Design a protein around this nucleic acid. Structure first.
Ligand code: ZN
Lengths: 50, 156, 208, 205, 121
RNA sequence: AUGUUUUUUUUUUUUUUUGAUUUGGUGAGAGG
RNA sequence: CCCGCAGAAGAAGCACCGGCUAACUCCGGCCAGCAGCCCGGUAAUACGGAGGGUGCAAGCGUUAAUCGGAAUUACUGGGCGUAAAGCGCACGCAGGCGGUUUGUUAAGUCAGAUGUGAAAUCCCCGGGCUCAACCUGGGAACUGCAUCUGAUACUGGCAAG
């Protein structure tokens, strides 16, 4: 849910180094946050500490 | 981390008693997006194998290149056989202005901004070699300072 | 037509026969015909089941078939339902009491015929022949073949000019009689024409 | 002077989502976004050096809805201007009035925004500007006029935008329906997938 | 090469002659068909290529290719030629759909290039 | 003694590596 | 220029899709035809039609013409044993170039200034037509020429070695 309890921008992307919605499907720009996704771009265990 | 570009693949023949035996040559070039570059020239009866061989060759015998930011440090000429090559450092935004085999080598090397003409022959294999030579010879400011027994501010 | 058939040259030594019976000049031709029939039937039936070798053996006015197949489960079906069905038809074909046995083929990648069949199938479903060939070779090698060769021929990639291509790996001695050379063949009836697949699989040399 | 055909086809061709439809419904549901258009979609051989560049150029052009001559002109302008060329070009593209409007959220799509601009809905510094290519400057307030303020489409667009990430380089008011173009955007603020450099190279043939 | 030498006698620019001289730097020229005929092309090709010897407005007697399938041209037919050589001695094409030369019948693609009007339906 | 003495398209693209085999509370019963 | 009226209404084509070159399939016999350079003889992604695509778009193609690519007349910036290219060999006027030191001159050279180098055009920062083209203010530039005042390493002149 964007943006509910289990958000994207507030915490992180479900998938590792992926915008959950759609951009960055390789290992080049880890961090960019487009307006269509409102998502960070890090590890799968990054949400466990945030 | 390494990026690898197959520049060209060319079919080459050997005449024998029966007829013509065909084979394939693959010219590749690999780089880490920083100073390190290496071209490889592989050969085999089938294309993919040849390409693989080329890649393997490339991966060993790499070479370091001193890069001032995204571009070169000064205008540099490089020659090899027919292909004589000029390449000139250029302002951020301009991109790799260079043709063919030459472009590929530059891209892997992690030069982002160049003005580069290939005079003479444009035989991919030779031209890439020439480019490599040019890159190799190109000295940095620090290096020059070291050579000359001076500081970097003395040279500017 | 240079080469001798690798199975055929070795029947006296390292390879055995498929049809294994005695008959006088009177009944021999008939027997042969029967064998041809039954085998044909079996091939037709158990196409989807991976079947390598049908071994016919008839003692005392009763036919014993032995089907070598990679997956018995699909040939047997439910325990003694499909086999039984097969049997009566076999009997009918022959005109004698039938008995079907089913040998389970360990390592279908090392059985040559099976491999050939697989390749043919692949060809039919429009894969890159070369990639299929590679797969065939590689797999066999992995499995522990001392060597393998495969050859495919004619209208490769639907090309107008037909040609043959072949991949060898390991050692495949054909002149050596004592070498266990499992040879077999198949034919891909593609849209552009037939594509014949040969495959030689060298298990190893027999010492006696 | 405009592309009037199927929008999702273009997106498909490109590979990416170009944002040529509002974003109520996801692009994967509306079309086979992975598969390229036409009879020979499933086949996808690696493109040439020229070809990739061309594709990139198209993508950018498609995104903003700018035909070729205009694009060329823009590129030229960028080149003329000081600083990084690709970046400059991008900035110029952004600066377009319709684009700005879209960003603000008065149009669901860029097309919608453009239409609005055309139909004398939008004002820039209290003066009705009708040109979609109008380059909006820093500190230039841009608003919906009182006639077009009642439209249901505008509010929908705004809502859509609100779901979408807000650009840092603008400041928009949903109630007042007026946004201030505070500054020309930095390259970091824009999307990272656009290889401006390729575009630059293409024109530097 | 030597600077002195150059000074003495400067570098000669290679003067490239025009491969369509009967136009005389005109995009097209009007001409009358002196005769119309078929000709066999050189190796390795095989055809009966339709061609017309044209007396031009400016006085030259040239031979012009006739593109497309079929043509209405006769002797004493006023045609426009455009330049372009068919790959012996033909350096010009008749513009189909100009003056007396008709557009090609039943053609739907590259229509412009053979004078053909847009099909209505 | 001698050979430009029957030419016609019987045509140039790989795999690529880069990532893993996936199951939370409640209550009841048995063994030691 | 502004306001009001009605209703998606009146408003999209051209070239191309063998490689170069972005875009592929099916159906019609070295013919008909294509072609800028390098197909067609019965499975043509190359001819013609279709469907599908690509590129431009109120234009799109073709032709002509110029520069470019062409470092393919190479001042910047090429060459000449075998690829085109060293006079058959010499002497030698004009011409080009000229070892080393000091002095002097100040022609070349360099520096600064003055005059001029029309306006427009080009380029920079601005302003005005809703934007743009277009118009427009100021600058820069116009690489030069002339004159005056210096500098004297280098080249030249003159004088001595
Ligand atoms: Zn994203």
């Amino acid at each position: 849910e964007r943006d509910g309890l289990f958000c994207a921008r507030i915490f992180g992307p479900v998938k590792d180094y992926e915008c959950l919605c759609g951009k960055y499907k390789r290992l080049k720009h880890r961090g960019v946050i487009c307006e269509k996704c409102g998502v960070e771009v890090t590890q799968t265990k990054v949400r466990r500490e945030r | 981390e390494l990026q690898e570009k197959l520049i060209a693949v060319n079919r080459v023949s050997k005449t024998v008693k029966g007829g013509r035996i065909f084979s394939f040559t693959a010219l590749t070039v690999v780089g880490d997006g920083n100073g390190r570059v290496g071209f490889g020239y592989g050969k085999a009866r089938e294309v993919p194998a040849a390409i693989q061989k080329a890649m393997e060759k490339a991966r060993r015998n790499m070479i370091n290149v001193a890069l001032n930011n995204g571009t070169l440090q000064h205008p540099v000429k490089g020659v090899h056989t027919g292909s004589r090559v000029f390449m000139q450092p250029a302002s951020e935004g301009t991109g790799i202005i260079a043709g063919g085999a030459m472009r590929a080598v530059l891209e892997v090397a992690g030069v982002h901004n160049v003005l580069a003409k290939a005079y003479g022959s444009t035989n991919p294999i030779n031209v890439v070699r020439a480019t490599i030579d040019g890159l190799e010879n190109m000295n940095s400011p620090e290096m020059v300072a070291a050579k000359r027994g001076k500081s970097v501010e003395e040279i500017l | 037509g240079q080469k001798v058939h690798p199975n055929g040259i070795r029947l006296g030594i390292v390879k055995p026969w498929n049809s294994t019976w005695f008959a006088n000049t009177k009944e021999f031709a008939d027997n042969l015909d029967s064998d041809f029939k039954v085998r044909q039937y079996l091939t037709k039936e158990l196409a989807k089941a991976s079947v390598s070798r049908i071994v016919i053996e008839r003692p005392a006015k009763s036919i014993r078939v032995t089907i070598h197949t990679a997956r018995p489960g699909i040939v047997i079906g439910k325990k003694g339902e499909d086999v039984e069905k097969l049997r009566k038809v076999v009997a009918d074909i022959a005109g004698v009491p039938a008995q079907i046995n089913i040998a389970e083929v360990r390592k279908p990648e090392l059985d040559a015929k099976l491999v050939a069949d697989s390749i043919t199938s692949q060809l039919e479903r429009r894969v890159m022949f070369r990639r299929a060939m590679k797969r065939a070779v590689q797999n066999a090698m992995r499995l522990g073949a001392k060597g393998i060769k495969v050859e495919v021929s004619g209208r490769l990639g639907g090309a107008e000019i037909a040609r043959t291509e072949w991949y060898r790996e390991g050692r495949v001695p054909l002149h050596t009689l004592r070498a266990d050379i499992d040879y077999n063949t198949s034919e891909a009836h593609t849209t552009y024409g037939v594509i014949g697949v040969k495959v030689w699989i060298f298990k190893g040399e027999i010492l006696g | 002077a405009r592309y009037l055909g199927p929008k999702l086809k273009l997106s498909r061709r490109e590979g990416t989502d170009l944002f040529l439809k509002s974003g109520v419904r996801a692009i994967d549901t509306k079309c086979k976004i992975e598969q390229a258009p036409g009879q020979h979609g499933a086949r996808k051989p690696r493109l040439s050096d020229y070809g990739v560049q061309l594709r990139e150029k198209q993508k950018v052009r498609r995104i903003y809805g700018v035909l070729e001559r205009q694009f060329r002109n823009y590129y030229k302008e960028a080149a003329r201007l000081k600083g990084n060329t690709g970046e400059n070009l991008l900035a110029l593209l952004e600066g377009r009035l319709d684009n700005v409007v879209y960003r603000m959220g008065f149009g669901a799509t860029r097309a919608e925004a453009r239409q609005l601009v055309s139909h004398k809905a939008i004002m820039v510094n209290g003066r009705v500007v009708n040109i979609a290519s109008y380059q909006v400057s820093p500190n230039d307030v841009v608003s919906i006029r009182e006639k077009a303020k009642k439209q249901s489409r505008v509010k929908a667009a705004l809502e859509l935008a609100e779901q979408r990430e807000k650009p840092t380089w603008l400041e928009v008011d949903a109630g007042k329906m007026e946004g201030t173009f505070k500054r020309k955007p930095e390259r970091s603020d824009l999307s990272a997938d656009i290889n401006e450099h390729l575009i630059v190279e293409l024109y530097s043939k | 090469a030597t600077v002195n030498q150059l000074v003495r006698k400067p570098r000669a620019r290679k003067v490239a002659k025009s491969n369509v001289p009967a136009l005389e730097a005109c995009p097209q020229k009007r001409g009358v068909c002196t005769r119309v005929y078929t000709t066999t092309p050189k190796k390795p090709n095989s055809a009966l290529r339709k061609v017309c010897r044209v007396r031009l407005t400016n006085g030259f007697e040239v031979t012009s290719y006739i593109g497309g399938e079929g043509h209405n041209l006769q002797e004493h037919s006023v045609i426009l030629i455009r330049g372009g050589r068919v790959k012996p001695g033909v350096r010009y094409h008749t513009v189909r759909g100009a003056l007396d030369c008709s557009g090609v019948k039943d053609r739907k693609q590259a229509r412009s290039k053979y004078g053909v009007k847009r099909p209505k339906a």
